Amino acid sequence: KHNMKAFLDELKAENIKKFLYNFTQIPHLAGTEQNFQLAKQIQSQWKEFGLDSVELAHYDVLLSYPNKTHPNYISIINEDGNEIFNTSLFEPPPPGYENVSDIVPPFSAFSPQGMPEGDLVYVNYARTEDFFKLERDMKINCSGKIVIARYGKVFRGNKVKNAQLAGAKGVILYSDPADYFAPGVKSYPDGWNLPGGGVQRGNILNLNGAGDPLTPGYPANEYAYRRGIAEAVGLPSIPVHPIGYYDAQKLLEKMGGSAPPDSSWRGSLKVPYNVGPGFTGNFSTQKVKMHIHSTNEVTRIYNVIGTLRGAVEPDRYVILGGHRDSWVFGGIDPQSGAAVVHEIVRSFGTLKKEGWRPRRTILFASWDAEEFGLLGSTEWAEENSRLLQERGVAYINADSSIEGNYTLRVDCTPLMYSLVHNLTKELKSPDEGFEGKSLYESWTKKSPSPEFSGMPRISKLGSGNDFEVFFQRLGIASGRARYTKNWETNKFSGYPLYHSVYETYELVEKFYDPMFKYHLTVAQVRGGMVFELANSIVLPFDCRDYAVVLRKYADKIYSISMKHPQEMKTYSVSFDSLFSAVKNFTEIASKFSERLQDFDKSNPIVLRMMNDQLMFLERAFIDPLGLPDRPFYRHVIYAPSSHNKYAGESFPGIYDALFDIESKVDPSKAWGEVKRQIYVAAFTVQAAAETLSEVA
Amino acid sequence: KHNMKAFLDELKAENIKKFLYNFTQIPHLAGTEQNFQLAKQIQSQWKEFGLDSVELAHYDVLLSYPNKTHPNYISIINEDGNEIFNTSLFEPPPPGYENVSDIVPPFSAFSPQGMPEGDLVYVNYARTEDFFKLERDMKINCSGKIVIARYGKVFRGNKVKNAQLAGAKGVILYSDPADYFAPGVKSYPDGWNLPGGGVQRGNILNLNGAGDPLTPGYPANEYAYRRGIAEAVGLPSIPVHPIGYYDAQKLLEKMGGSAPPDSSWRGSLKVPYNVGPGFTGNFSTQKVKMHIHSTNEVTRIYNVIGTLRGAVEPDRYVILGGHRDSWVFGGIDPQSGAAVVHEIVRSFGTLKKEGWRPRRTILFASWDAEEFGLLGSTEWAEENSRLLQERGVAYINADSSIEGNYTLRVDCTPLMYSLVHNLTKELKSPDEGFEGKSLYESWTKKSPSPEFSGMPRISKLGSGNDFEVFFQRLGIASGRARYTKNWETNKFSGYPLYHSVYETYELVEKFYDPMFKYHLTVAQVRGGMVFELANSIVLPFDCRDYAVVLRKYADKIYSISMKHPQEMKTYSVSFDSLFSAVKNFTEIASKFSERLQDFDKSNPIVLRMMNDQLMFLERAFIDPLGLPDRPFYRHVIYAPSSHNKYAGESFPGIYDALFDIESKVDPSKAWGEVKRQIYVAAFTVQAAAETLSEVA
Ligand SMILES: *[C@@H]1O[C@H](CO)[C@@H](O[C@@H]2O[C@H](CO)[C@@H](O[C@@H]3O[C@H](CO[C@H]4O[C@H](CO)[C@@H](O)[C@H](O)[C@@H]4O)[C@@H](O)[C@H](O[C@H]4O[C@H](CO)[C@@H](O)[C@H](O)[C@@H]4O)[C@@H]3O)[C@H](O)[C@H]2NC(C)=O)[C@H](O)[C@H]1NC(C)=O
Ligand SMILES: *[C@@H]1O[C@H](CO)[C@@H](O[C@@H]2O[C@H](CO)[C@@H](O[C@@H]3O[C@H](CO[C@H]4O[C@H](CO)[C@@H](O)[C@H](O)[C@@H]4O)[C@@H](O)[C@H](O[C@H]4O[C@H](CO)[C@@H](O)[C@H](O)[C@@H]4O)[C@@H]3O)[C@H](O)[C@H]2NC(C)=O)[C@H](O)[C@H]1NC(C)=O
Ligand SMILES: *[C@@H]1O[C@H](CO)[C@@H](O[C@@H]2O[C@H](CO)[C@@H](O[C@@H]3O[C@H](CO)[C@@H](O)[C@H](O)[C@@H]3O)[C@H](O)[C@H]2NC(C)=O)[C@H](O)[C@H]1NC(C)=O
Ligand SMILES: *[C@@H]1O[C@H](CO)[C@@H](O[C@@H]2O[C@H](CO)[C@@H](O[C@@H]3O[C@H](CO)[C@@H](O)[C@H](O)[C@@H]3O)[C@H](O)[C@H]2NC(C)=O)[C@H](O)[C@H]1NC(C)=O
Ligand SMILES: *[C@@H]1O[C@H](CO)[C@@H](O[C@@H]2O[C@H](CO)[C@@H](O)[C@H](O)[C@H]2NC(C)=O)[C@H](O)[C@H]1NC(C)=O
Ligand SMILES: *[C@@H]1O[C@H](CO)[C@@H](O[C@@H]2O[C@H](CO)[C@@H](O)[C@H](O)[C@H]2NC(C)=O)[C@H](O)[C@H]1NC(C)=O
Ligand SMILES: *[C@@H]1O[C@H](CO)[C@@H](O[C@@H]2O[C@H](CO)[C@@H](O)[C@H](O)[C@H]2NC(C)=O)[C@H](O)[C@H]1NC(C)=O
Ligand SMILES: *[C@@H]1O[C@H](CO)[C@@H](O[C@@H]2O[C@H](CO)[C@@H](O)[C@H](O)[C@H]2NC(C)=O)[C@H](O)[C@H]1NC(C)=O
Ligand SMILES: CC(C)C[C@@H](NC(=O)O[C@@H](CCC(=O)O)C(=O)O)C(=O)O
Ligand SMILES: CC(C)C[C@@H](NC(=O)O[C@@H](CCC(=O)O)C(=O)O)C(=O)O
Ligand SMILES: *[C@@H]1O[C@H](CO)[C@@H](O)[C@H](O)[C@H]1NC(C)=O
Ligand SMILES: *[C@@H]1O[C@H](CO)[C@@H](O)[C@H](O)[C@H]1NC(C)=O
Ligand SMILES: *[C@@H]1O[C@H](CO)[C@@H](O)[C@H](O)[C@H]1NC(C)=O
Ligand SMILES: *[C@@H]1O[C@H](CO)[C@@H](O)[C@H](O)[C@H]1NC(C)=O
Ligand SMILES: *[C@@H]1O[C@H](CO)[C@@H](O)[C@H](O)[C@H]1NC(C)=O
Ligand SMILES: *[C@@H]1O[C@H](CO)[C@@H](O)[C@H](O)[C@H]1NC(C)=O
Ligand SMILES: [Ca+2]
Ligand SMILES: [Ca+2]
Ligand SMILES: [Cl-]
Numbered sequence A, B: 001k002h003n004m005k006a007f008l009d010e011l012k013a014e015n016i017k018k019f020l021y022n023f024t025q026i027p028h029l030a031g032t033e034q035n036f037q038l039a040k041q042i043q044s045q046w047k048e049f050g051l052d053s054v055e056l057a058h059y060d061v062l063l064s065y066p067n068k069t070h071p072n073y074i075s076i077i078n079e080d081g082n083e084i085f086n087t088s089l090f091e092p093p094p095p096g097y098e099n100v101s102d103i104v105p106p107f108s109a110f111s112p113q114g115m116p117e118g119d120l121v122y123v124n125y126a127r128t129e130d131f132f133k134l135e136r137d138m139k140i141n142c143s144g145k146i147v148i149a150r151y152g153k154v155f156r157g158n159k160v161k162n163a164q165l166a167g168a169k170g171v172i173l174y175s176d177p178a179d180y181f182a183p184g185v186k187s188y189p190d191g192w193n194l195p196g197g198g199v200q201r202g203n204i205l206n207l208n209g210a211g212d213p214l215t216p217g218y219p220a221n222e223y224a225y226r227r228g229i230a231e232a233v234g235l236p237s238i239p240v241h242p243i244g245y246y247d248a249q250k251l252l253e254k255m256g257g258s259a260p261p262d263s264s265w266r267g268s269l270k271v272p273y274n275v276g277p278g279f280t281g282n283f284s285t286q287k288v289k290m291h292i293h294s295t296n297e298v299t300r301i302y303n304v305i306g307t308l309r310g311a312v313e314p315d316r317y318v319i320l321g322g323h324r325d326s327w328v329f330g331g332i333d334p335q336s337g338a339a340v341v342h343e344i345v346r347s348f349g350t351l352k353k354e355g356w357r358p359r360r361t362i363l364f365a366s367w368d369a370e371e372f373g374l375l376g377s378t379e380w381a382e383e384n385s386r387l388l389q390e391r392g393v394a395y396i397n398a399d400s401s402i403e404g405n406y407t408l409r410v411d412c413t414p415l416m417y418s419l420v421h422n423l424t425k426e427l428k429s430p431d432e433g434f435e436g437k438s439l440y441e442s443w444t445k446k447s448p449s450p451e452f453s454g455m456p457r458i459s460k461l462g463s464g465n466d467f468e469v470f471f472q473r474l475g476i477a478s479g480r481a482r483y484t485k486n487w488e489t490n491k492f493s494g495y496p497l498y499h500s501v502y503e504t505y506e507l508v509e510k511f512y513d514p515m516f517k518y519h520l521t522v523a524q525v526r527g528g529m530v531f532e533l534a535n536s537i538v539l540p541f542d543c544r545d546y547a548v549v550l551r552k553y554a555d556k557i558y559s560i561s562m563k564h565p566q567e568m569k570t571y572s573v574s575f576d577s578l579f580s581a582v583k584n585f586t587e588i589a590s591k592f593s594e595r596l597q598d599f600d601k602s603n604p605i606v607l608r609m610m611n612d613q614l615m616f617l618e619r620a621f622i623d624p625l626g627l628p629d630r631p632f633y634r635h636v637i638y639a640p641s642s643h644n645k646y647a648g649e650s651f652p653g654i655y656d657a658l659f660d661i662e663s664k665v666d667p668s669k670a671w672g673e674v675k676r677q678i679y680v681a682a683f684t685v686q687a688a689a690e691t692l693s694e695v696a
């Protein structure tokens, strides 16, 4: 028969392996011919796999590339203006790829051009709190300095924004062995650690959900009217360049000025980690000079969109999407995800050729230009926003299936918590020592919930991937699942070879997943979720799980405010409305759940009415006015952190109103805005609750 | 049986008459006790009439009232500062009402306080083109002058905005007999003309759809956080007061300076209509002084919301709404509408008591505070926006049923054109000389379409009534219908006794509609529309009618642009994308219409899928970013005119970008913005078209 088990049993580790090899032999950088050729290949294969239609959706977006005949690099210059040390022009290519053409050298995409020259200040991870420590506690002024920051902890675009706001005239980003070299493991090609010549590529935009910097709000189609570059969204104002730890050692070893303030500022290199500014006595007349010549260029990109039409509710869409573009070979990011999507489409297509169709329509997407700011997913969603907001049931992301081989890592809306628990209880653990046990059992053992015994950790959605437009702009229930490494403290830093030329097929096959069993398990989780969302008669969302988390978030935000009890008295700052709304949501959700299990199961209108109530529940948390100064982050419960795009923040409007409030010059105005955000949150929670009330 | 004919036959002229008398014996000013008492009465009666639930929804909004012990008035002062002439403190009350308490004296709601003193400039109707003529052609400077303007042609808030922008320090509004005294008709109480002591009340806000000035975006509930008055939306900065033509004659008779520029500036009073500034030689040292002491006050208002639950689609809402608050007795505005709504609810309730229910849910609303800026409808829609945008099928307004007795006047979305044609063909004309003929026949004869032989005129929706939030903010298909007077050239000026103490029951019964036959016909049109919208199996919308009008609007906007052919060449301004989108909409709508008539009529999912496509078609014209500087006008095809809130403008984003473009100092920038608006319009039309495509 044609059920979830038939779907899941058709998925094969060996196919995922074959696909990963196929997708990682040459670079697939967004906007390049090689990436268009792969788009055409996946379009052809998805048609052959059995999808009803498979189309390319193209857009012309702003991208950024180094100048091939004018390379980017950093120097130390002496007082004569001789360049006495230069950083590398490329990463040493991996064995057997030293003749591959078109490997883009390391660069920070969207850096402006410039040749700034100055003294270095070391800023640790360039986090908001690192800059607070420098300016407020240490009294070090970054104005007109070049800052050097280690990668890790937060999205690199936030580091750049923080350095600009501190008055830096350039930023150097580097990978410290403390963050990218696990003790006791060898460097690539002999292990999975970053070598000293390896460098992490990546964009440094602050788009806040806008998509293409030139066309915020509207798709970058053939007649689009573009902003001028001076009005573009999210571009950095100062030059930025990334380097490896061999080169960083050379820039850091001569650093003078103040000692590091404590040990959380010292990495693993044999240098003092002095903060500066500038070099010690003998070298105090030497300076650092950047040479950045990259150009921004409007360039065509291509999404592949595959449709499997639903048999009963073809106007309800379940979307499985992940990106195809890579920095170089994309052995983990993104092709370990794309190979999994490819096998899922193949399995669904096998069932379709046997006469089966899902209840609801399934859309499959291979997005382009994710690495340049989620551009392909965002432009397509802008083009199709009316269809998505009235018809979109759920979005399941599918970037890298593995970033480690320890346990599962899931981030999703609370509406999917019960679905994920139930599905993982029905899947076999691939883990050593859990033979014969469920994935739920191994995952719960290795990643326990901080709040509940016998349950696994599930995190908030932040951003930094292609679910952002669907979840934070449009309010479509979204989720993601992948295998990860131990110690989720380091989760925002990436794995050691992230965005380097060393992320290859061989890396995955030799060091991560030789039997492709972790890939297979992740295919069963993502595919199983899509199967349930597209086939369950009642949508598999539990509104009571939202009620639980809303109380947790309300307790958390109240606790932050209560660090300022005198101000809460003076300005009559009350959270009563917010707790009332959460209480009401809890009561209404409980009654709705009772009707959902009781309602006349023979009545397809009451069913679809109740399915519409479940589908539009995530949508109810959207505020059409957006969050302050971030018009494309419209979800009132969740937004990417203003300090770290990768992290989700709960009740973000109230959180940002409270952040560093003790430093605001006009406290009455500042606390007025806290009160306004409490009203907006309490109203939105109550409005969302009321969508679950009886409809008339 | 229980069909539309049973509904329509139950409606009685005599009941409408009884209700109108009942609703007009005492003033029902928003925020007053008398108006709360009437809300409670209508709640009780709607329950007794048979509705499933009837609730009050209350809000606390900014309202404005004169000071009872410090009256507003205008003077002419001599050089000694003696007040030699004062305007009236009240309108002489009508016969038998001279002892009615709490008649609010004439005032302009939301005027600031002030006692400005200066020279008068006469500005005709204070339209954008009147100010253009004064400053540009006549070289008259209004800076620091008091302007005097006649009512008519455009909404009074636009006059006030125009006077402020010209630098006026006060505005005097008056009713000229040219606009408010029909030749050969007697003054009230002997006829329906405005007496010389009659004065038109009315608010002078420029809200642009915001609702309560203190809470834009969110309902003014019990925990709302308000803006300070300095940040309130839409308040005027200069004092404003209205007067009758006896008083206006006294202010205008001494006017000197320049002669009127032509005869379209002269009204019917025996004065020169000199433009000023100031008075002629002998009186040149006299000035005009305003004394305004009104206060703005947050005040509770109450909407009555009645529900008749649908039998098959209870989660689909058809709304019939109109306001209850009046300036004084509200004999025409609004109680001639409210009495009709009351009889419609009574008829629906009779059918319900016999076991009938409509297919879809019908919501009935008695809105408060319409006269102070559409506040009650807008706050309720802000509170319920998530429910309305996912479930709202249609909104039918119900302000005054009659403003004349000549023929029908309909404004609606093109989606309702076919519904209105079909219904009026099935109704009897009440008109003299059309006995035995259809309403369609009399209406088409008296108000022919400017474009099509054998069809009636149907106008665009503008604003100035409670449909605004539903149609221009939320994108719910909306319509309105009433009986009107001849010569629709004067349609924006009102009938002579509009917003005066003389609008009484006696006015309607003696002079407008003694047999209540025009009221009955309007009840059959509004009720018949609500019946069809709530009961037709397929929603009674024809998307092909939108396609026709979109081509007309595209031709019109292209023609405006083509007055500037040299600029269109220089800046490559092309309308090709917009015409392409309209062509595509036309083709897709045609194919959708074919499926709608062909689809398997036994399949309720294809039906509801296709009903959802019809319901969300109006919704597709909403841009979540709004129009420039008008965030609550989000419909891209229609917005209230920026020059006249009562008039609708088509493709408003392009129209406003083109308006007076030859006067912009930076033509490249100005034409860039025209091109941006063409892209937005072309994109939105294509996106709306695509919602009618096959769904997968
Ligand atoms: C969580 O869910 C509950 C419902 O269980 C909501 O409760 C409502 O809470 C508000 C307070 O925010 C109450 O508002 C009060 O309404 C009174 C009149 O209520 C009657 O009439 C209405 C019809 O209009 C009915 O809906 C209702 O059942 C009652 O019969 C007003 O008189 C109150 O105003 C007076 O008191 C206040 C406070 O002291 C003064 O400031 C005023 O000036 C005035 O004197 C007040 O407005 C409302 O009645 C409650 N509804 C109920 C119980 O059904 C919560 O609001 C909701 N939480 C959130 C965050 O939305
Ligand atoms: C009204 O409806 C029609 C559909 O009937 C839409 O037509 C589309 O119009 C656009 C132009 O705006 C066409 O875009 C062109 O697409 C070419 C590739 O198309 C092929 O591949 C796609 C899959 O990606 C298929 O959908 C399609 O069927 C084709 O097989 C590009 O090569 C074109 O770019 C090249 O030419 C232009 C113009 O000279 C250059 O500027 C470029 O640099 C490049 O050389 C171009 O982008 C699109 O193909 C049309 N779709 C069709 C026919 O199905 C209208 O757009 C629509 N109106 C509006 C307002 O939306
Ligand atoms: C995840 O799995 C759990 C456990 O199976 C699911 O909860 C269970 O769901 C069913 C509904 O299919 C409930 O059965 C019902 O029981 C009541 C009597 O209590 C009866 O009236 C109904 O006719 C029906 O048989 C069952 O109680 C419930 N168990 C719980 C809550 O412990 C859950 O729905 C799954 N989550 C999904 C699909 O998202
Ligand atoms: C307003 O009234 C007109 C005239 O009645 C309505 O148009 C008519 O609608 C019916 C659909 O109920 C059409 O009948 C169909 O004819 C085709 C064959 O051409 C057949 O395949 C179908 O089975 C069905 O019988 C009829 O053609 C059509 N007449 C027209 C367009 O002239 C119109 O729908 C009404 N508008 C509303 C309800 O909004
Ligand atoms: C990846 O797999 C695809 C699909 O099998 C290969 O593309 C095919 O190559 C054959 C032989 O060269 C051609 O005849 C077909 O036209 C191709 N099919 C499609 C759908 O493109 C591709 O060569 C493989 N790539 C690598 C690097 O191994
Ligand atoms: C670092 O690179 C720079 C640029 O290529 C080198 O400086 C150049 O040296 C050549 C040959 O001596 C001169 O013709 C250029 O005028 C120099 N350019 C600049 C911008 O200074 C420099 O030698 C390199 N330093 C090393 C390898 O230590
Ligand atoms: C308007 O009609 C209503 C409803 O008939 C009248 O209110 C009723 O008055 C009677 C007798 O005074 C009371 O016993 C009822 O309690 C009232 N009913 C309701 C539902 O309020 C009202 O008096 C009429 N008003 C005028 C001015 O004639
Ligand atoms: C217009 O009204 C004003 C204000 O009431 C009158 O001027 C006042 O006259 C009284 C009695 O003579 C004085 O006590 C006040 O000091 C005056 N007030 C002001 C503000 O001037 C004025 O007489 C009236 N003019 C008429 C009726 O022609
Ligand atoms: C496989 C993961 C490590 C990919 C990682 N995302 C990611 O690398 O996306 C890119 C682009 C993200 C963005 O521009 O928002 C980046 O961070 O440089 C994430 O989802 O955490
Ligand atoms: C019966 C009509 C003459 C009522 C008329 N509307 C109306 O009087 O509304 C009021 C308030 C309108 C507003 O504030 O938008 C006004 O214009 O003063 C209209 O719809 O044209
Ligand atoms: C890149 O640098 C070369 C060589 O100096 C120069 O000729 C060219 O203008 C640059 N290319 C771009 C795209 O700016
Ligand atoms: C940092 O330095 C610049 C000038 O070199 C100055 O404008 C700025 O105010 C300084 N900030 C401080 C001292 O906080
Ligand atoms: C994969 O698992 C093995 C066994 O625990 C381990 O030695 C290896 O380090 C893991 N690989 C990675 C990349 O973590
Ligand atoms: C109205 O005027 C009176 C009398 O001059 C004054 O006492 C009162 O303050 C005013 N009322 C308001 C509401 O401003
Ligand atoms: C109108 O008068 C004021 C000063 O009385 C002046 O500021 C303004 O520029 C004048 N406008 C003209 C002459 O257009
Ligand atoms: C009502 O109709 C009669 C007959 O044409 C006419 O004399 C009268 O003026 C009309 N009333 C109004 C208010 O137009
Ligand atoms: Ca865009
Ligand atoms: Ca409001
Ligand atoms: Cl992912």
Ligand SMILES: [Cl-]
Pocket: B397, B398, B399, B400, B465, B480, B481, B482
């Ligand atoms: Cl109306």
Ligand SMILES: [Zn+2]
Pocket: A323, A333, A334, A370, A399, A400
């Ligand atoms: Zn990725």
Ligand SMILES: [Zn+2]
Pocket: A333, A371, A499
């Ligand atoms: Zn990446």
Ligand SMILES: [Zn+2]
Pocket: B323, B333, B334, B370, B399, B400
């Ligand atoms: Zn009215």
Ligand SMILES: [Zn+2]
Pocket: B333, B371, B499
């Ligand atoms: Zn009115």
